[PDB]
Amino acid sequence: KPQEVRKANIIAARSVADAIRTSLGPKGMDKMIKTSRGEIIISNDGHTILKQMAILHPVARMLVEVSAAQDSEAGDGTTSVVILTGALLGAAERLLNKGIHPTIIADSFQSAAKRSVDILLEMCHKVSLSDREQLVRAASTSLSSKIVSQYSSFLAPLAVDSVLKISDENSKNVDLNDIRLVKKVGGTIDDTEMIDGVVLTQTAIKSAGGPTRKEKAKIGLIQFQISPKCNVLLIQKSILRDAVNDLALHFLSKLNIMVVKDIEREEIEFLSKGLGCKPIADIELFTEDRLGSADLVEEIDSDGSKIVRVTGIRNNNARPTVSVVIRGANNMIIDETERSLHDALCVIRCLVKERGLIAGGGAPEIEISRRLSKEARSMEGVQAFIWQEFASALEVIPTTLAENAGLNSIKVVTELRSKHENGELNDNTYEEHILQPVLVSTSAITLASECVKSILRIDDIAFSR
Amino acid sequence: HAASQMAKPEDVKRRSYRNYGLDLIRGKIVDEIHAGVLEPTISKVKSLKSALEACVAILRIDTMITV
Amino acid sequence: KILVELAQQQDREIGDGTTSVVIIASELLKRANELVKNKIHPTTIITGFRVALREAIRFINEVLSTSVDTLGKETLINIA
């Protein structure tokens, strides 16, 4: 029974989706997870639940990879994509009882996903990146879900102005890993410096002889360490042996060469991209062509930070990589602010790759299910019946939102089909400032079609070592 | 307290008095203001608000995962 | 363990009334579980408490009063 073995994995996969189903939305139910090490963590984020769940089931681990790609591409909807995946698995259970092979089930999802996107783009309102008033109100609403509210007014133009410089035109995917959120102890939320050139994670030399400032400097990346025309050099942090000898600090001080040591190993790959330089393993291969370009290098300390900033890289291959600096008093300030602004950059990232926006709250899922139900008569054969089950599987997202909010399940869903007939995208979430970008709803359906496909295509599993 | 709040919003009262306490020493119901039992506002507001904060987090857990 | 952190929150700030806080939170959980058979949604139970909590503080603020009854009566005398 090769199909019955797969049905056992489908039931186990739907059980995971039912656990995440209660956590959907800000009013969703939290989940308590106790790790084997003894750490007790709790949260409503579906991405953090599936990461620490330590699923031993081979097929159920696909939801973790989809949730990882959901946050890496769209950045939002990691919880809803798991529920949407379980809906197609439940709809395919009745298909297997009718004698339908999963290939037709998987192939029809490709035509259903591409059709759902084209229908979604018809009702979507196309927006342009040249309008700065739309991007401020879009990121400001995403910051209302956190403790910081009144201080988020100055954080809205911070995320908008950083993307517009690197957006250009027809950039398609824009990696947010190049945008670094600098978390330093001290200061306040209202104190922020863009410093579009670059921002490091480390301080300067506190010993005697260190210039700490240099004009017209070339910054290279050196993975080597000095232990028993380059103005500024970087030394990789190594706790095993000594990084930079005290005698070497006095030697380079006479040569008017600024030294910054103890560079974090995580930022080595980050600085090799935005600065457009190359890592130098050995001094024998160390040349001038691998250096950077900096007009002025200075160390500016607001309060206690003692951080060095660089501006005007002016590199042809490299681009204006911007690092955002975040200040705050308590540790819980710069932390929650980091995750809040990270989700704001993901919403802006969705508008750059795909223009247009829609109103959230399960509004498009109702009309798409209505249009696909009427268009199902245009097809013929087994594929025609799949369009009817695919439309019913899209109604689980708006139904769960009504269940987790305390409202009547079946009553609110009927009110959606009734109001959406006369009006178009009017139900009002636009007056409530609820805006979900179209790329999130597009990626949630696209990744669900590939996730359910990779499930049904497994007809058996055996021990392999 | 039932008959005490009936004439309270009317801004007129005859036998209606509020702030009836419980005296367990003498075993009778008297006003705690005259009895000498008083508590600050900071103590009662933070005790009532924090009590619900822990009650919500308990009702939001529908699943317990333990390795 | 949630009530353990709740007990430490009242001690580090007010330092008094920790016993009364645990009793209040214990009865709320007993009455909330009885609403499960009544088909009452937990979020409505949570929202019903948050809306009532904001209005309860307003009602408490109406009966608050400063030190009074200094002339004609005695208050601080019965304390000592």
Structural overview:
The PDB classes it as chaperone. The entry lists the keywords Allosteric network, ATPase cycle, Conformational landscape, Cryo-EM, chaperone. TRiC at 0.05 mM ADP-AlFx, Conformation 2, 0.05-C2. Chain A: T-complex protein 1 subunit delta. The organism of A is Saccharomyces cerevisiae S288c. This is part of a larger assembly, with one copy of chain A (465 residues) and two copies of chain B. Chain A has 465 residues and is α/β, with parallel strands linked by helices. Chain A folds into three domains: 1-127 and 356-465, Orthogonal Bundle (GROEL, domain 1); 128-196 and 320-355, no CATH class; 197-319, GroEL (3-Layer(bba) Sandwich), CATH 3.50.7. Chain A has 15 helices and 14 strands. In chain A, the strands form six sheets. Chain A has a four-stranded antiparallel β-sheet with strand order 4-11-10-5, with no helix packed on it. In chain A, strands 1-2 form a two-stranded antiparallel sheet. In chain A, strands 3-12 form a two-stranded parallel sheet. In chain A, α8 (246-254) links the parallel β7 and β8 (258-263). In chain A, α7 (155-167) crosses α10. The longest helix of chain A has 23 residues, at 331-353. The two termini of chain A are 24 Å apart. Chain B is mainly alpha-helical. Helices cover 34% and strands 4% of the residues of chain B. Chain B contains two helices and one strand. The longest helix of chain B has 19 residues, at 41-59. Chain B is elongated and about 65 Å long. Chain B starts with 31 loop residues before the first helix and ends with a strand. β1 (31-34) of chain A pairs parallel with β1 (64-66) of chain B, so a sheet runs across the interface.
